[PDB]
Write a protein that binds this ligand. Structure first.
Ligand SMILES: [Mg+2]
Ligand SMILES: [Zn+2]
Lengths: 1042, 163, 55, 78, 617
C-alpha cells in the first residue's frame, strides 16, 4: 500500500504555491504611509507565474537556476483624489521544485531538508528542589514571537517571566490585560490558590499594573500607563510580531480545552486564564491534568520547504514594506506609480540566501537512487530554530517510544550527528498540521478489516488504544491467530487476548526506513550492523553493468521509481524507435510518445547518471512496463552491487581484521568498475596590469605538450589527459614580449581520463559571468575505475572491508566443479558482530544461482513458522540440488558447507566451508596524500592543510605527548620547528638534505613570534630575557624579531 | 572533609602539624588510589598503580597557610608541603615563630592552574585570567617544562634532551 | 640483514644503562662517520661499529 | 630558493674560466655583487683604463662564453 | 648557548607602547602613530600613508622597493626615500613592526575591569558596578570631597545629585570650596594615581592583624594585589590606557582572492574613527553630552578590540557573526596556543588507507610508491645529483615528474634503512606512533603488520594512517633506537605483552594444538624425534591430531597429567619404566633417566618445534 515515497517534499511546495504565498502576501497587503494619503493594496490572491526561462536541462547544463517570476496585481489608492493606478508589479524570482522533489540552484541539485522542531502550544513541567516540594511551571511557545513562562513558587505564588526578564506575579499581567477580579475569579476553578498570590502581592489595578509592567520590562524610564499598554500590545497582541500559528491554536485548544476560532492566532485573555487554571489544577492534582513530554512526537512538528520558504518570504516582505513606506512618505508629490513604488531586491535577496546559503537547503546526495531518495525523506533536529550540537544531549538523541512507525530506529549517522538526523519510516506521512502519522488496520472482534481503508493515526492518538504489530499472523479472511498478542498501550509493551486489540500495523517493515527495508534477513542481524549496512547502502557506486540481487527484499522496484531515473511506458502499445539517446512508443491506437535519455551526466558526488533503454525495436509493450533504466537499476528495481561467489574462511592473513581478499575476475570481467566524472574550472580575470588571455602561446613549453589543444588554448573533447597535462592554456600579464606568465589549468596529480565536455561561457555570449571575470571555461573529465587494493567493499548487512589482495584465479580456492571463488571473507568477523543474516543470503543466493531464480524475501518472515528463514533456505537448497543433479551442491550433514580445494597446491581444506552468492557493493571515494614542501598559512607560516592544495598532516598535541613519552627530543624538535614554521630553518634543512650535509640547529618558530606580538598588542609587556653572566650587570632583553 | 577530619584528629592524637598533615594526606591518598583502581578494574581493565600514584601526588601535595608566623607566607596561599616544612624548620632554627597550615586536596584542574610557569597555565585553560594575573604579579617563566620548550621550540628536558 | 641490525641494536641498548645516552652516542658517531666519509647509511655503520667494538 | 643558490654557482664556475679582468668586468657590468648594473664610466674611473676599453673587454669575454664549451648547462635555465 | 633564558610579562606602560611603535627617521621625523582609518587604495591597491597598512610605519609592501617608486632593487639598502620617506628594505618587517594609536581620552583595559578578580575594583576598594558606571559615564565620582559635609571621597553622584551640588556650589552664599568630581576613565586614572601603595599596605596590614572572617580575606586580597604592585614597581594607573598598540599588518592580512580582510581591521577602524571624531568634538567645543557619548563609544570600541563581547554587546560583522578580537585569537581550542604552538601541521607527511600485510615483518611497513616518491623527494634529488649524471635540481625534478625508471631504483636505495613513523588519528597512548622500515609496494594503501594493529587499535575497514619521515641523523637514530616497532613488546601501562598473536593466528594455533578424537589416523606410532614426527605428518602417514609418541628429552608441561606414575615396571635388570599419562620414563635403578617418550599430537610437535627453532636460530 506504499504511497509516493517523496511526498513530504511535494505536498509542502504544492501547499506553498496554493495557499502559503497567498497568506503572506495578504497578511502585508494594505500598506499605508504615515500621513494616510496613499495606500498600496496587494491583491495577492491573483499572483500569476511566468513560465520558466531556459529549461530544467538548460539550467543544469548552463549552471543556472530553475525558477519563475512572480507578478502580483496591486492598486495604489490616493486617500483623497481617489486616483487608483492599477498595475502588476514584479515581486521576485521563485525557484521551482522539479518533478523529483528537488530544486536546481546555480546549476546544482539541492534539497530542502525537513526540520523536526518543538510544536507550538503550552507545556507543563514539574521540577523538584533539593529539599523542597514539587513546583510546576508552564511554558507557552508560539510559532513566532515571545514566550510566556508561568511558574509556581514553593509558597504557592504564581510568577510570570516575560522574555528572559525578572519575574512578576500573575496579578500584574492579568490586570494589565483588562480583566476585573470577578472574571479571573470565576474562570479559575480553585480561586483560593490564586487568592493567596493576590493577598501576598496586593491587588493591582489596571493603571498600576501597566505602570509596574513597564517598569519591570524597561527599567530606567518613567512608567506610563499608555507606555505599558503599548508594550503589551507589541509583545503578545501584535499580529505582525506574535503568531501562534494554526498548529499553535490547535494545540492550545486541544490542551487547555478552549473553543477559540482557528483564525485567531494571537494570545487572548481566555488563553492565559485557562493556562493558569491548568497550572493550579496540576498543582492541586485535580485529575485531568498532566505534565508534558517534549520528546513525544505528538508535541513535535515537521517543517518542510513550504514553511521555511513562507518565513523567508515574510522577512523579505517586511523589508520591502519598510522600503515602500520610506519611498512613499518622502515624496512630496503624488507622481508615484505602483511599479516605481515596490523594490523586489529584499525579497529576491531573502529567497536567494535561503536557497543558496542556508543550512536547511543542502547539496543533494546523489551517489545512487537510494541516497537520493533518503535525502528527501530526512528529518533534522538542527538548524535555524532547532538544536545545536553542543546543546543536544543524551535525551534528545534516543528512541522515544512515540517513534514507532514514524521515524526509523536504525538509519542514522555515526559520530557527532548520531541521533540528531533520522529517516522517515516506510508508511509514515506528515499531515497538514505537521505531525507524523502512520497507518493501521482496524480490528473488530479480533478480525483484521483489510476491506476498509487504512486508518492513519498520530503519536498522541495511538496512546489509549491497544495496537498490535504488523507481524501478527491472521488466518483465512482476517481473524488473528494465537492466544496472546503483543500490543502497545500508553507507550508500553504488553500482551493481550486477541479480542481486545484495537489496531494492527499494515506491514512488518512499517517501523524501519526505506534503506533499512532493503536488507533481507534483517531480523537475524544486530541493530548496529543493520545501521552500518543501511548507511553503507547509500554510499554504493553505480557500476558499469548493474545486476539485481538474487535475495532481494521486494522494495527494490519501488525504491527506484521515485528517483525519477527509470522510464516506464504509460501506454499499451508498440515500440517504434529505439536508440542510445531516444525511445519512441506508438500507442496501440493513438499518438506517439517520445523520451530522451540522459547519457553520461555527472552527479553532485561525481558518479555517473546514465540512462539506457531496455526494449528493442518493434516490441509489444504494456502500460507500466519498464522502458529505460538508471545507473543503479537493472530492470525496474534497484541494483547497487553484484552477486559473486563467496566463501567464509581465512586466507594466509589476507582476511585479517575485516580485510577482504578477492579474485582477479572482478577486475578483468569489469565487475565493480564505475564511471566517475570530475569538473575542472578556469577563470579569465582582469588584473590591474591587464587582462588574462586563453591562448596556446604558453611560455616555457614545447609543442610536444600542446598536441590536444583546439587552436584556442583549450583541450579537445575526446582527448586522453594524464597527470600534469594542460587542460586550458592561460597567460597572465605579470609585471617586472617576454612579460606573459603561465598559470594554465592542468590535471591534478593522480588524475587521468577522457575529456567529455568543454563548455565555455563569456559575457558576450549572454552568460552571467562573475563580477571580475571575462571567461569561464569548464571541463569535464570522465574515467573508469576498477576495483583495486585499498577500495572499500560492503554488504547489505553491515559487513564492510578493505580489499588487501587481488589473487590470480588459479590461486583462489575452487569448487568441486572447477569454479574458482570470487571473494574469501573471514568468519571471525561474523559471530562477534552478530550479522548472521549474511550467512542466510549467501546460501539463498547460492540456491538462486543454481535454480535460475530470484527470491523476494521480506524482513521478519518468521510470523509464518518457527524458523522460516532456515527452512526456506534448506528447502531451496535441496530443490536446487535435485534440479541440477549435482550432489555436491548441498550436503545433509553440513547444510551450508561444501568442499573447497586449494588453488595453490590442489589439496582440499580439512573441513568444508560456507560458500554462496553474496550481493556486495563498492563504496565511494582519492584519499592518498603526501607532501614534502608546499604552500603555507598567512599568519603562522605553517603548511596549509588539504589534499587539493598539497597540504600537510597535522601533528596534534596527542602526538606530541606520544613523542614526549618515548623520550624523543630530536624528532619532536625537528617536527615542531624545522618542518612546520621555522621560516629560515626550513630552507636550510632542505638545502642540507639536497646537498647532503647535516641539518643545522633550528631557531624560534614563527608562531611563537606571532603570539608574542599579539600579546604585546593586548597591552602586555611580555618579553624574552637573557640573564646577566657577571654580578653587576642587568639582564638584557633579547630581540627575537631580528 | 575527610582530609579535614583526619587532620583534626591527627593534630591532637599526635600533636605536631607536620606529621598530622603527612598522615592525613597519606590516608586520603590511599583512599583515592584504591577508589580509582577499583573503578577501573570493575570493567576489567588493569593499569599499574604507579600511574595513579603520580597523579594523586600531583593532587595531594599542597597546603594552605592558615596563619603565617615570621614567614614570608601570607595566609590564603597554596604552597608545597616540603617548602613549608623547610621554611618552618629554618625559621625555628633561628628561633622565630613558625607558620600554621592545613593540607588541601586540589583536583586535576585546580592543581594545573597553580603551577609556577604562566605559559603552561595560560595554554591550558582560562588564558585571559592567567595572563592578567601574570601581568599583575610581574611573573617570569624560566622554561623548565615540556609544554614550554615545546612552545618555544627547544629540546624538551626529558629523554634524549635531558642534558 | 635487518635482523642482524635489530640484534645489534638490542645488544647496545643493554650494557648502556641509558637508552637516551646510547642513542645520542649513535647519533654523534653516525654524524662523524658521514662527515669523514663524504670527503651504507651513517646510522647503520655507526651501530655496526659500536657493536663490533663491544667484543 | 634552491634553484637560486645552485644557479649562481654554475655561473661563477663558467666565470672562473674567463680571465680575471674579464670576469670582474662582467660582474660589475651586470651587478652580480651589488645588484646594481654599472655603466662603462664607473668602471672607466674605478678600473685602470677608461671608457671604450671596458666595452672591448665585455665583448671579448662574452665571445668566450658564447662558445659551446665552458658554458652549456645554463642553456637549460632559459 | 641559548639566546634567551626566561620570559617575563609585566603591565605595559604608555611609554613602553610608544617605544614599541615609535621609530625615528633620518630626516628627524618620528613615525609610528596610526592616524587615519584607511587600509588600501581602491584603484592602485597600494597602502595609504597614515593608515592601518602604512608603509612609512610598518614597512615597504614590496621588499627593496620604495612606495613612490624612486628606489628599486637591492642596491638601495637602508636608503629611506625622500619623496615619501619609506625605508627600502625587506617586506618581512611588515610582520614585526607595530606602531601605536594615541587616544584623545583615556580608556580602561577591559581585562582589568571585567575579570573574575577585578583588579581596578580591588585596588580602589569599590564594587565592580560602581567602577563600570563611572567608566561608562553613568555616574560621577567625588575626586575630592573638598569642603562639603555630606560628600565623601570616592562617592557616586547621579546626574541630578551633581546638578544639586552645582546649584550649591554656585550659590552666592556658599563657603563650599575645593570640591571636584569626575566621570569616565579619566576619573579612574585620577583615583589610581591617588593611591599611595606604601601607606595602603601599612594600613591594610594593621587592619588585617585586628581582623578575621571574610573581612580578613578581602583585606588579604587587597594586600596581595598592592604588594604585587609594590614589588613590580608598576604604577596602577597603567591599567587605564592612554595609547594602544597596533598589531603588524601581516598578522591581520588583507589579501586579494575580492579582498579577504581580518576582523582586526574593522575593529581598529572603529577605534580610529571614534578617536578622530572625539578629537574634532574637543576641538570645536561640542555640547558636553555629545562629547561624553563619544568617549563612551571610544571606550566600547577599545573594549571590543581587546575582547569582543566581554562587557557589552557583541560587534557582529557583515553576517551576523561575532568579530574575532585579540582575546579570541589566544584562547580556546582554536586559539593560538592549542592550534599552532602545542600542535602543528608538519611537512614530509602523508596519509593513506591501511591494509594488512601478512608477509611483512614486525619492524617493516608497506609504503606505496606514490607516497614514497613525494615524501623522499629531497633525498632522491640528492642521490640523483651525486651518484648519477644529473647536473642541477631542475633536471632531477623534471626527471622525477616524467617518472623515469631510474627514479624508482634511486628511491629504493634511498629508503632502505630509513625509519618512518606511522600514526593513527586517535593517539591515546605512546604506541599510537611507531617506527617501521619502508618497503616499496604497488598500490594506494599502506601495508601494516597484523601484530601492531592492537597497539594502534586499527582494523582494515577504512582506517587511515599518517606517515612522517625523520630528517636529521639524530631523528633517524631516535626513531630506530626508541620508537621502532620491533622494540615495543610490553605495554608501558601494565607491563604485559602487547605483540601477542590474536584472531586468526590464535585460532590457527588452537586448531593445530587441539585434540580431535574423530581423526586419529596413525595413532600410537613412535618417532625418533620432533623432526621425524613432523616429516611423518608432512607425508600424510599420521593425522594432524593423532596421539603419537615422540622421543623427546627435555622439560615437558602436559595439562591433564598425573604426578603419580600410572604404571611402574621393573625389568629383568635395574631399570624401571614409569609410564605416566603422557610420558614414559626409563630410569636406572637408584639412578638417572635413560629415555623419555612424550605422548603428543603432531600439531603440538609442530608448535613447540617452531618455538624452539625461533629461539635457537
Ligand atoms: Mg576501523
Ligand atoms: Zn619614495
Amino acid at each position: 500500500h506504499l504511497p509516493d515515497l517523496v511526498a513530504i517534499q511535494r505536498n509542502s511546495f504544492r501547499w506553498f504555491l496554493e495557499e502559503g504565498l497567498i497568506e503572506e502576501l495578504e497578511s502585508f497587503s494594505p500598506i499605508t504611509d504615515y500621513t494616510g494619503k496613499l495606500e498600496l493594496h496587494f491583491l495577492g490572491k491573483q499572483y500569476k507565474l511566468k513560465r520558466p526561462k531556459y529549461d530544467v536541462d538548460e539550467a543544469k547544463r548552463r549552471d543556472g537556476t530553475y525558477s519563475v517570476q512572480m507578478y502580483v496585481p496591486t492598486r495604489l489608492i490616493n486617500k483623497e483624489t481617489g486616483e487608483i493606478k492599477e498595475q502588476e508589479v514584479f515581486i521576485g524570482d521563485l525557484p521551482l521544485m522539479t518533478d523529483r522533489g528537488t530544486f536546481i540552484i546555480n546549476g546544482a541539485e539541492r534539497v530542502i531538508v525537513n526540520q523536526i522542531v518543538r510544536s507550538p502550544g503550552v507545556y507543563y513541567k514539574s521540577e523538584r528542589d533539593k529539599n523542597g516540594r514539587l513546583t510546576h511551571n508552564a511554558s507557552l511557545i508560539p510559532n513566532r514571537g515571545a514566550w510566556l513562562k508561568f511558574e509556581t513558587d514553593k509558597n504557592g505564588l504564581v510568577w510570570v517571566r516575560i522574555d528572559k526578564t525578572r519575574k512578576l506575579s500573575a496579578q500584574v499581567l492579568l490586570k494589565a490585560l483588562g480583566l476585573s477580579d470577578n472574571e479571573i475569579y470565576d474562570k479559575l476553578r480553585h480561586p483560593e490558590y490564586y487568592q493567596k498570590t493576590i493577598d501576598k502581592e496586593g491587588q493591582f489595578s489596571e493603571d498600576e499594573a501597566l505602570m509596574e509592567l513597564y517598569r519591570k520590562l524597561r527599567p530606567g524610564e518613567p512608567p506610563t500607563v499608555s507606555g505599558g499598554q503599548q508594550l503589551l500590545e507589541s509583545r503578545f497582541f501584535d499580529p505582525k510580531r506574535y503568531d501562534l500559528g494554526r498548529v499553535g491554536r490547535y494545540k492550545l485548544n486541544k490542551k487547555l480545552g478552549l473553543n477559540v476560532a482557528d483564525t485567531v492566532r494571537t494570545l487572548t485573555s481566555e488563553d492565559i486564564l485557562a493556562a493558569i487554571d491548568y497550572l493550579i489544577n496540576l498543582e492541586l492534582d485535580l485529575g485531568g491534568c498532566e505534565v508534558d513530554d517534549i520528546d513525544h512526537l505528538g508535541n513535535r512538528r515537521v517543517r518542510s520547504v513550504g514553511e521555511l520558504l513562507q518565513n523567508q518570504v515574510r522577512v523579505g516582505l517586511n523589508r520591502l514594506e519598510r522600503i515602500i513606506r520610506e519611498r512613499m512618505t518622502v515624496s512630496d508629490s503624488d507622481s508615484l506609480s505602483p511599479a516605481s513604488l515596490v523594490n523586489p531586491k529584499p525579497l529576491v535577496a531573502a529567497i536567494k540566501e535561503f536557497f543558496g546559503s542556508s543550512q536547511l537547503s543542502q547539496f543533494m546526495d546523489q551517489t545512487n537512487p537510494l541516497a537520493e531518495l533518503t535525502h528527501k525523506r530526512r528529518l533534522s533536529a538542527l538548524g535555524p530554530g532547532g538544536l545545536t550540537r553542543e546543546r543536544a544531549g543524551f535525551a534528545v538523541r534516543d528512541i522515544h517510544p512515540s517513534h514507532y512507525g514514524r521515524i526509523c530506529p536504525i538509519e542514522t549517522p555515526e559520530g557527532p550527528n548520531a541521533g540528531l538526523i533520522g529517516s522517515l519510516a516506510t508508511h509514515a506521512r506528515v499531515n497538514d498540521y505537521g505531525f507524523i502519522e502512520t497507518p493501521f488496520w482496524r480490528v473488530e472482534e479480533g478480525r483484521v478489516r483489510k476491506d476498509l481503508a487504512p486508518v492513519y493515526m498520530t503519536a498522541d492518538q495511538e496512546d489509549d488504544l491497544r495496537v498490535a504489530p504488523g507481524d501478527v499472523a491472521t488466518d483465512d479472511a482476517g481473524y488473528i491467530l494465537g492466544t496472546t498478542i503483543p500490543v502497545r498501550y500508553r507507550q508500553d509493551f504488553t500482551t493481550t487476548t486477541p479480542e481486545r486489540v484495537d489496531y494492527v500495523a499494515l506491514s512488518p517493515v512499517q517501523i524501519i526506513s526505506v534503506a533499512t527495508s532493503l536488507i533481507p534477513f534483517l531480523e537475524h542481524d544486530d541493530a548496529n550492523r543493520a545501521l552500518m549496512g543501511s548507511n553503507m547502502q547509500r554510499q554504493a557506486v553505480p557500476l558499469l553493468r548493474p545486476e539485481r540481487p538474487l535475495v532481494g527484499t521486494g522494495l527494490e522496484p519501488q525504491a527506484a521509481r521515485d528517483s525519477g531515473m527509470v522510464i516506464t511506458s504509460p501506454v499499451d502499445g508498440t515500440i517504434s524507435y529505439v536508440d542510445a539517446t531516444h525511445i519512441e512508443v506508438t500507442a496501440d491506437t493513438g499518438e506517439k510518445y517520445g523520451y530522451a535519455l540522459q547519457k553520461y551526466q555527472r552527479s553532485n558526488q561525481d558518479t555517473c547518471l546514465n540512462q539506457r533503454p531496455i526494449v528493442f525495436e518493434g516490441d509489444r509493450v504494456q502500460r507500466g512496463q519498464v522502458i529505460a533504466d538508471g545507473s543503479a537499476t537493472e530492470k525496474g528495481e534497484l541494483a547497487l552491487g553484484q552477486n559473486i561467489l563467496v566463501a567464509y574462511m581465512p586466507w594466509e592473513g589476507y582476511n585479517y581484521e575485516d580485510a577482504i581478499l578477492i579474485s582477479e575476475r572482478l577486475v578483468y570481467d569489469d565487475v565493480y568498475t564505475s564511471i566517475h566524472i570530475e569538473k575542472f574550472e578556469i577563470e579569465a580575470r582582469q588584473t590591474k596590469l591587464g587582462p588574462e588571455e586563453i591562448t596556446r602561446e604558453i611560455p616555457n613549453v614545447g609543442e610536444d605538450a600542446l598536441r590536444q589543444l583546439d587552436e584556442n588554448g583549450i583541450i579537445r573533447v575526446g582527448a586522453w589527459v594524464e597527470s600534469g597535462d594542460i587542460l586550458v592554456g592561460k597567460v597572465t600579464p605579470k609585471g617586472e614580449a617576454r612579460d606573459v606568465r603561465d598559470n594554465s589549468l592542468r590535471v591534478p596529480n593522480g588524475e587521468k581520463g577522457r575529456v567529455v565536455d568543454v563548455r565555455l561561457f563569456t559575457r558576450e555570449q549572454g552568460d552571467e559571468l562573475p563580477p571580475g571575470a571575462n571567461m569561464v571555461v569548464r571541463v569535464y573529465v570522465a574515467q573508469k575505475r576498477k576495483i583495486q587494493v585499498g577500495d572499500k567493499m560492503a554488504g547489505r548487512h553491515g559487513n564492510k572491508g578493505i580489499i588487501s589482495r587481488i589473487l590470480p584465479c588459479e590461486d583462489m580456492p575452487y569448487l568441486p566443479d572447477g569454479t574458482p571463488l570470487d571473494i574469501v571473507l573471514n568468519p571471525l568477523g561474523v559471530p562477534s558482530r552478530m550479522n548472521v543474516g549474511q550467512v542466510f543470503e549467501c546460501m539463498l543466493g547460492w540456491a538462486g544461482q543454481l535454480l535460475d531464480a530470484r527470491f523476494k524475501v521480506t524482513p521478519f518472515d518468521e510470523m509464518y513458522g518457527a524458523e522460516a528463514s532456515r527452512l526456506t533456505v534448506n528447502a531451496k537448497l535441496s530443490e536446487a540440488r535435485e534440479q541440477t543433479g549435482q550432489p555436491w551442491v548441498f550436503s545433509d550433514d553440513e547444510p551450508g558447507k561444501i568442499q573447497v580445494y586449494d588453488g595453490r597446491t590442489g589439496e582440499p581444506f580439512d573441513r568444508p566451508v560456507t560458500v554462496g552468492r553474496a550481493y556486495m557493493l563498492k563504496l565511494v571515494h582519492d584519499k592518498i596524500h603526501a607532501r614534502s614542501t608546499g604552500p603555507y598559512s598567512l599568519v603562522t607560516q605553517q603548511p596549509l592543510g588539504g589534499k587539493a592544495q598539497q597540504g600537510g598532516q597535522r601533528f596534534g598535541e596527542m602526538e606530541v605527548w606520544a613523542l614526549e613519552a618515548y623520550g624523543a627530543a630530536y624528532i619532536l624538535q625537528e617536527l615542531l620547528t624545522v618542518k612546520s614554521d621555522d621560516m629560515q630553518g626550513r630552507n636550510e634543512a632542505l638545502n642540507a638534505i639536497v646537498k647532503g650535509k647535516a641539518i643545522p640547529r633550528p631557531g624560534t618558530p614563527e608562531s611563537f613570534k606571532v603570539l608574542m606580538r599579539e600579546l604585546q598588542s593586548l597591552c602586555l609587556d611580555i618579553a624574552v630575557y637573557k640573564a646577566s653572566t657577571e654580578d653587576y650587570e642587568e639582564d638584557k632583553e633579547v630581540d627575537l624579531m631580528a | 572533609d575527610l582530609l579535614e577530619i583526619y587532620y583534626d584528629y591527627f593534630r591532637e592524637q599526635l600533636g605536631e602539624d607536620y606529621e598530622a598533615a603527612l598522615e592525613s594526606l597519606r590516608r586520603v591518598q590511599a583512599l583515592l588510589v584504591n577508589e580509582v583502581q577499583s573503578v577501573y578494574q570493575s570493567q576489567g581493565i588493569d593499569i599499574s598503580d604507579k600511574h595513579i600514584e603520580v597523579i594523586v601526588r600531583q593532587m595531594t601535595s599542597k597546603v594552605r597557610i592558615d596563619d603565617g608566623g615570621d614567614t614570608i607566607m601570607l595566609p590564603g596561599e597554596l604552597h608545597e608541603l616540603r617548602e613549608v616544612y623547610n621554611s618552618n624548620n629554618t625559621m625555628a632554627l633561628t628561633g622565630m615563630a613558625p607558620a600554621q597550615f592545613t593540607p588541601v586536596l586540589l583536583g586535576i584542574t585546580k592543581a594545573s592552574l597553580n603551577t609556577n610557569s604562566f605559559i603552561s597555565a595560560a595554554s591550558f585553560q582560562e588564558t585571559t585570567r592567567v595572563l592578567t594575573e601574570a601581568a599583575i604579579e610581574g611573573k617570569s617563566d624560566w622554561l623548565r617544562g615540556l609544554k614550554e620548550n615545546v612552545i618555544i621550540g627547544r629540546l624538551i628536558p626529558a629523554g634524549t634532551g635531558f642534558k | 640483514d635487518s635482523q642482524d641490525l635489530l640484534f645489534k641494536a638490542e645488544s647496545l641498548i643493554v650494557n648502556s644503562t641509558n637508552r637516551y645516552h646510547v642513542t645520542l652516542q649513535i647519533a654523534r658517531r653516525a654524524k662523524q662517520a658521514r662527515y669523514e666519509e663524504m670527503e651504507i647509511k651513517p646510522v647503520l655503520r655507526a651501530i655496526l661499529e659500536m657493536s663490533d667494538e663491544l667484543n | 630558493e634552491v634553484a637560486k643558490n645552485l644557479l649562481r654557482e654554475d655561473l661563477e664556475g663558467v666565470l672562473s674560466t674567463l680571465s680575471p679582468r674579464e670576469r670582474d668586468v662582467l660582474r660589475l657590468r651586470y651587478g652580480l655583487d651589488d645588484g646594481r648594473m654599472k655603466t662603462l664610466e664607473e668602471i672607466g674611473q674605478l678600473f685602470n683604463v677608461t671608457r671604450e676599453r671596458i666595452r672591448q673587454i665585455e665583448a671579448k669575454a662574452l665571445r668566450k662564453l658564447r662558445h659551446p664549451n665552458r658554458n652549456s648547462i645554463l642553456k637549460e635555465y632559459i | 648557548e641559548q639566546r634567551f633564558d626566561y620570559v617575563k610579562i609585566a603591565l605595559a606602560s604608555p611609554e613602553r607602547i610608544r617605544q614599541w611603535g615609535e621609530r625615528t627617521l633620518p630626516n628627524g621625523q618620528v613615525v609610528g602613530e596610526v592616524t587615519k582609518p584607511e587600509t588600501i587604495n581602491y584603484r592602485t591597491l597600494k597602502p595609504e600613508m597614515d593608515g592601518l597598512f602604512c608603509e612609512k610605519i610598518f614597512g615597504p609592501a614590496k621588499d627593496w622597493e620604495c612606495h613612490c617608486g624612486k628606489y628599486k632593487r637591492v642596491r638601495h639598502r637602508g636608503i629611506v626615500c625622500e619623496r615619501c620617506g619609506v625605508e627600502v628594505t625587506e617586506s618581512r618587517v611588515r610582520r614585526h613592526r607595530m606602531g601605536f594609536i594615541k587616544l584623545a581620552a583615556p580608556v580602561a583595559h577591559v581585562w582589568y575591569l571585567k575579570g573574575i578578580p577585578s583588579y581596578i575594583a580591588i585596588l580602589l576598594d569599590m564594587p565592580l558596578r560602581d567602577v563600570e558606571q563611572i567608566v561608562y559615564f553613568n555616574s560621577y565620582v567625588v575626586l575630592n570631597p573638598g569642603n562639603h559635609s555630606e560628600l565623601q571621597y570616592k562617592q557616586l553622584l547621579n546626574e541630578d545629585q551633581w546638578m544639586e551640588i552645582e546649584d550649591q556650589i554656585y550659590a552666592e552664599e556658599s563657603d563650599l570650596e575645593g570640591i571636584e568630581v569626575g566621570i569616565g576613565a579619566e576619573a579612574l586614572q585620577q583615583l589610581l594615581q591617588d593611591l599611595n601603595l606604601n601607606e595602603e599596605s601599612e594600613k591594610l596590614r594593621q587592619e588585617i592583624a585586628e581582623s578575621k572572617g571574610q573581612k580578613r580575606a578581602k583585606l588579604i586580597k587587597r594586600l596581595r594585589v598592592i604588594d604585587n604592585f609594590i614589588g613590580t614597581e608598576s604604577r596602577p594607573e597603567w591599567m587605564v590606557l592612554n595609547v594602544i598598540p597596533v598589531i603588524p599588518p601581516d598578522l591581520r592580512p588583507m589579501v586579494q582572492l575580492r579582498f579577504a580582510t581580518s576582523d582586526l581591521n574593522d575593529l581598529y577602524r572603529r577605534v580610529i574613527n571614534r578617536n578622530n571624531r572625539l578629537a574634532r568634538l574637543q576641538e570645536i567645543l561640542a555640547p558636553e553630552i555629545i562629547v561624553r557619548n563619544e568617549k563612551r563609544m571610544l571606550q566600547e570600541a577599545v573594549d571590543a578590540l581587546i575582547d569582543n563581547g566581554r562587557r557589552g554587546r557583541t560587534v557582529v560583522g557583515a553576517n551576523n557573526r561575532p568579530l574575532k578580537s585579540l582575546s579570541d585569537i589566544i584562547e580556546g581550542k582554536q586559539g593560538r596556543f592549542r592550534q599552532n604552538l602545542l600542535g602543528k601541521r608538519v611537512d614530509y607527511s602523508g596519509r593513506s588507507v591501511i591494509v594488512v600485510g601478512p608477509n611483512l615483518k614486525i619492524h617493516q611497513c608497506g609504503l606505496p610508491r606514490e607516497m614514497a616518491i613525494e615524501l623522499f623527494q629531497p633525498f632522491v634529488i640528492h642521490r640523483l645529483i651525486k651518484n648519477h649524471s644529473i647536473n642541477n635540481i631542475k633536471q632531477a625534478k623534471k626527471l622525477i615528474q616524467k617518472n623515469d625508471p631510474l627514479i624508482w631504483d634511486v628511491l629504493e636505495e634511498v629508503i632502505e634503512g630509513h625509519p618512518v613513523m606511522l600514526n593513527r588519528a586517535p593517539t591515546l597512548h605512546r604506541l599510537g606512533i611507531q617506527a617501521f622500515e619502508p618497503i616499496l609496494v604497488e598500490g594506494r594503501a599502506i601495508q601494516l603488520h597484523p601484530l601492531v594493529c592492537p597497539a594502534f587499535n586499527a582494523d582494515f575497514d577504512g582506517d587511515q594512517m599518517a606517515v612522517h619521515v625523520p630528517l636529521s641523523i639524530e631523528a633517524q637514530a631516535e626513531a630506530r633506537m626508541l620508537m621502532l616497532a620491533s622494540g615495543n613488546i610490553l605495554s608501558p601501562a601494565t607491563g604485559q605483552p602487547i605483540v601477542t598473536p590474536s584472531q586468526d593466528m590464535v585460532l590457527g594455533c588452537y586448531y593445530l594444538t587441539a585434540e580431535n578424537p574423530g581423526a586419529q589416523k596413525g595413532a600410537g606410532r613412535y618417532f625418533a624425534n620432533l623432526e621425524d614426527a613432523i616429516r611423518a605428518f608432512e607425508q600424510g602417514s599420521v593425522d594432524l591430531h593423532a596421539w603419537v609418541w615422540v622421543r623427546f628429552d627435555g622439560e615437558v608441561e602436559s595439562e591433564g597429567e598425573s604426578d603419580e606414575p600410572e604404571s611402574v615396571v621393573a625389568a629383568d635388570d635395574g631399570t624401571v619404566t614409569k609410564t605416566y599419562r603422557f610420558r614414559r620414563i626409563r630410569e636406572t635403578e637408584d639412578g638417572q633417566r635413560l629415555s623419555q617418550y612424550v605422548k603428543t599430537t603432531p600439531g603440538r610437535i609442530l608448535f613447540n618445534n617452531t618455538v624452539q627453532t625461533a629461539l635457537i636460530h
